[PDB]
Symmetry: D2
């Protein structure tokens, strides 16, 4: 397939619904060799089982809480014992404390909630780019992250995650501008709403889903298969002319203003 010979590290698998799972499946289908991180020991077993079904194995699964620089560096040190280089990093991770995402933005947003949202959802992408730079050197590889329309325009409850996604998208451009000379491309998919574990935590998520379904040009919601294909493409040599890009996979909802 169009990723044959590529090696990809995938950060963010939590369940069969995860966007990272859609990306993993597509990349494997297209021939990529895969490795994984898991956030903690409660998710470890499930990620290990998933890896075994995507051509991978438990010894290519590594612990990584992206709050922790030491753990992030330890991923690449461990991976480097198995692989003499790396082509792709997929960053499919986000978090803000629940109290940040339930209520009036001004009332509920706090300094610490803000700190955490930006640290986990935006800085962690830079952290992976940094720690993986040496393994990716000379491979003309790519980095991919995931964003959401909330970075550009507002909706109830998404709140400070919108600020963190805006930070993240700027990061995509600054990373592209920095890593491009040595051959690395850096892009994101901005997905439409998809029912995932994380999506469940936004109390009004179903309203986002509904608005997208009724107003998006395709008049249906997107799938992790569609996000995965877009991500697979962006991390392939087919996309070698594309860097710094935020690619929407939302049926075109972002191009509408039918409020």
């Amino acid at each position: 397939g169009f990723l044959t010979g590529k090696r990809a590290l995938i950060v963010g698998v939590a369940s069969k619904l995860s966007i990272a799972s859609g990306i993993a499946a597509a990349m494997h289908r297209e021939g990529a060799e895969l490795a994984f991180t898991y956030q903690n020991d409660k998710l470890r077993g499930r990620v290990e089982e998933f890896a075994s079904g995507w051509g991978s194995r438990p010894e290519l699964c590594f612990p990584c809480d992206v709050a922790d620089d030491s753990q992030i560096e330890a991923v690449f040190a461990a991976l480097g014992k198995h692989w003499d280089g790396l082509d792709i990093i997929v960053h499919s991770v986000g978090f803000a404390p629940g109290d940040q995402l339930d209520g009036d933005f001004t009332a509920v947003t706090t300094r610490e909630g803000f700190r955490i949202a930006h640290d986990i959802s935006a800085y962690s992408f830079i952290a992976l780019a940094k720690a993986g730079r040496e393994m990716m050197k000379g491979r003309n590889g790519s980095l991919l992250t995931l964003s959401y329309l909330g970075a550009e325009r507002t909706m109830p409850n998404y709140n400070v995650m919108g600020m963190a996604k805006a930070s993240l998208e700027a990061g995509v451009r600054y990373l592209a501008g920095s890593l491009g000379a040595e051959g690395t491309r850096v892009n994101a998919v901005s997905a439409g709403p998809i029912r995932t574990l994380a999506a469940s935590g936004i109390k009004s998520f179903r309203k986002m889903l509904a608005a997208n379904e009724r107003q998006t040009p395709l008049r249906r919601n997107v799938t992790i298969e569609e996000v995965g294909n877009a991500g697979a493409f962006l991390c392939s040599d087919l996309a070698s002319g594309i860097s710094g890009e935020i690619l929407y996979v939302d049926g075109g909802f972002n191009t509408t203003a039918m409020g």
Copy 2:
């Protein structure tokens, strides 16, 4: 490849250098069956030649000056006698009278120059969408056009083509909003500068090339192979979640405000 089973109409091949040629080659490589238009008889011979190299033939090549509604409609009438229906239309066509793109925007832009630029570069995409709607019904296919950063931000000489491209990009969105419910996706690639017949017509194009090479994140100009691959992907079922999109294939130049120190 990821287009085997699809049928595409390619509008805009002029030479081996054309972006439409890069797209045609990628789509052919990926398994698409191709048909072609040529602007007029000055380009017929070359388009027929190229088509035969891309799995196609002269009887799947049709005259089409996109200023002319009846020529446009006659393409699909003629094509529909060979093809059941149609999955893909690639719109890779632009024009403004030469004097519109040489000198101060305010001084050289005219009503007639404006009319023509918008008619050929923007309305013609809508015309193809309309004329091909019947052949594309039920096929869950897609439309692709080509744009340039000049639509969003200014540079010397691009001038009224910048207005026409802005119109075109809005057109992508209005077409996507109109045709999506029945299954058709509508997108564009906004390409970085590439040496083509039309590009060579722009004074200071050489400088645009040098500017991009120095300042673009990838520190190199893009190719019609790279634009071709992006266009092929957008018109494939791999992109079934994507409509209304303006996808930049420019190495990231559009994301920069200044070049390196």
Copy 3:
């Protein structure tokens, strides 16, 4: 006020509801001396009447169908026998054939509907810039046009006016890039929906109004007084650092993707 000493030409007054009327009233309040155009003799009487209420007079009112270059040029020739120079032009004009704005975009949009929409709604701003350039020479003045969110994102029925507005907004940028060196600033206000004569022609306009009221951050529709004030500011020396800008006066509606729960 902050416009005392300035002279402004206002194109687009039709009724007391017009955006151009809100702009005219605000500029008059702030001390500007005003001149006016009227599209044709159907609006001459009301425009002359309104002008006399804004410190002006029939002799500073001129016929101008912006489809017609010779009429446009005759405005400035005639005005120049009263005024030795001009600081400001306000361009508050739009048109597309009615059937272009009623129904499915792909089905109802035509080449001729497209031509007219872009000719009147977009090129005419360029035409004013060109024709008034001599009179604005050395005055460090400004141009203002009016746009709508439909240029960037889609909604029912706005259709080809959305393409024309996108063209116009690029026009703002290219004019700014061309005329800035000699001192002229060029901007637009992108207004939220307002009940005007033209707006009343759009079916489902009442839905656009209700949509904005519920979803806009300020939870209320905007007024021609608010648009008028923003336009007055943009055309004043208070805004001397501002050119090429599309300023939204829509209560923030454009910054929202969904309304409140």
Copy 4:
């Protein structure tokens, strides 16, 4: 003038060159009653002297390190002793550690430098909005912050400040969406490059100045007088139809690609 009867708190005066000083001068000219904060006791004296010349006085100057929630709350507590309400808050501050802004983005950006840049340059705007909400209640007032093109497109060395500004501009929109119903408008000016104390800290600032000068439509750089007039306008009832907006005052540079 068009701010007569308005009371404004201005956060960010450091010297006669400050953007905040340009905004203060314009607002005072237009009739606003002003109060001020100062970052530390080194700047206290200078801010006090400036206040006296802008119709204000030393007792309307308050300490505020915007890293500190209690100090921020203490500003409004103290100001409330003097004013029974507040109309305007101007947020004109930023900071990132110098090592973040000198060199390759991927190489020099760190988790802590990221945290600080976002905390001081972005979250602090939300903090002021929150702390001032009661004093602003029912006055149909406004909030203003300052941003920079670096939020949208990249340039050498601006680096993580670009991410922080992108966060800030999303903040402008989320605040607008939250505070609008009760009558508060929220906007920013995105200024072109201006020689200020903070600007001099960016190693390549003169290259930014030069690019703006040669490529901006007006072919000259903007002044704090021009930024202050725009900010004064945005915080006036003349701008009562405008919220959630990022108003560029850069001579049009942002609209150019080659210029």
